[PDB]
Amino acid sequence: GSMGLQEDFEQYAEKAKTLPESTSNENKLILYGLYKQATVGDVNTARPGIFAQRDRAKWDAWKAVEGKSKEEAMSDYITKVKQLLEEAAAAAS
Ligand SMILES: [Cl-]
Ligand SMILES: [Cl-]
Ligand SMILES: [Cl-]
């Protein structure tokens, strides 16, 4: 990752903590998948079964961004968090 992007990523991963607890799980899943992809790369497990204890929705969100470089997924994660942060501020004003 380039330096400025890595700094941005760590900053926005920290700012993501300020999103309301009530943030839709649809968006939590999008952030989860990009965060996994950005930090550890391609999902390296098989899809959890429907009745498994492993969370299929989380795995699916990560599978969906397979193939993105660290730079790309950090990029997307940042843009999604930025959008959510602006929407949270709009909701509160
Ligand atoms: Cl920025
Ligand atoms: Cl929801
Ligand atoms: Cl992992």
> How long is the chain?
93
Whether the Cβ atoms of residue 42 and residue 55 lie closer than 8 Å to each other = no
Q: How many domains does the chain have?
A: 1
Give CA–CA dist 29/25, Å, rounded.
6
- The CATH number covering residue 77 comes to 1.20.80.10
Q: How far is the CA of 91 from the centre of ligand 3 (A)?
A: 33
Cα of 3 to ligand 1 centre, how many Å? Answer: 13
CA of 48 to the centre of ligand 1 (A): 36
Tokens, residue 38: 């950005």
> 35 alpha carbon to ligand 3 midpoint, in Å?
10
Print the domain residue range for 73.
1-93
Ligand closest in space to the Cα of 26:
2
Distances (CA, A) of 63 to 19, 23, 37, 60: 24, 22, 9, 5
DSSP 4-26: HHHHHHHHHHHHGGGS-TT--HH
